Amino acid sequence: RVASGAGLPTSRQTTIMVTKYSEKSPITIPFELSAACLTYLRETFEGTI
Amino acid sequence: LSQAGAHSLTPLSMDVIRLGEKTVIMENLRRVYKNTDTKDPLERNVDLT
């Protein structure tokens, strides 16, 4: 506030209270594998090169 | 009045300009009226007819 001269209107005390909120935005991405890839990853047959 | 002056003096930083062997201080009073109700008396209206 600024003090005023005699006779002028004066400034009232003022309190301002404010609230602020958050926001949400998720992301995603897929990846895929083949049945043959999983078969050879999980198990092995008669050992060969 | 002159001998009533204060004795101690403090240093503080400000900008000056040279105007023909005359140095003057430059200031803006934005700080004083930053969020107050009073208007800056250096911002004025002018009428032309």
Side-chain angles (χ1 to χ4, degrees):
Chain A
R1 297 181 295 152
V2 185
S4 50
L8 278 296
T10 51
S11 310
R12 210 206 98 215
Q13 289 177 271
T14 293
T15 44
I16 292 162
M17 287 156 61
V18 164
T19 173
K20 190 173 279 276
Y21 297 91
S22 65
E23 298 178 34
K24 51 194 166 191
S25 55
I27 68 180
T28 181
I29 188 77
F31 74 88
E32 55 186 302
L33 296 175
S34 69
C37 170
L38 296 181
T39 296
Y40 282 106
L41 183 77
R42 287 279 156 203
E43 62 183 319
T44 184
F45 316 97
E46 174 188 56
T48 185
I49 311 100
Chain B
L1 288 177
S2 71
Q3 67 202 35
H7 309 293
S8 184
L9 77 180
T10 189
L12 80 185
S13 174
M14 43 185 57
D15 312 342
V16 313
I17 180 174
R18 302 188 308 272
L19 288 177
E21 72 268 345
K22 182 188 300 289
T23 70
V24 315
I25 293 157
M26 295 181 293
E27 178 160 35
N28 59 295
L29 294 170
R30 185 66 188 132
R31 308 185 311 285
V32 189
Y33 308 104
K34 187 57 156 64
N35 290 307
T36 57
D37 291 335
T38 53
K39 189 168 176 168
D40 183 350
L42 289 166
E43 292 178 314
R44 306 295 294 212
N45 305 305
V46 165
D47 279 351
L48 297 175
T49 305

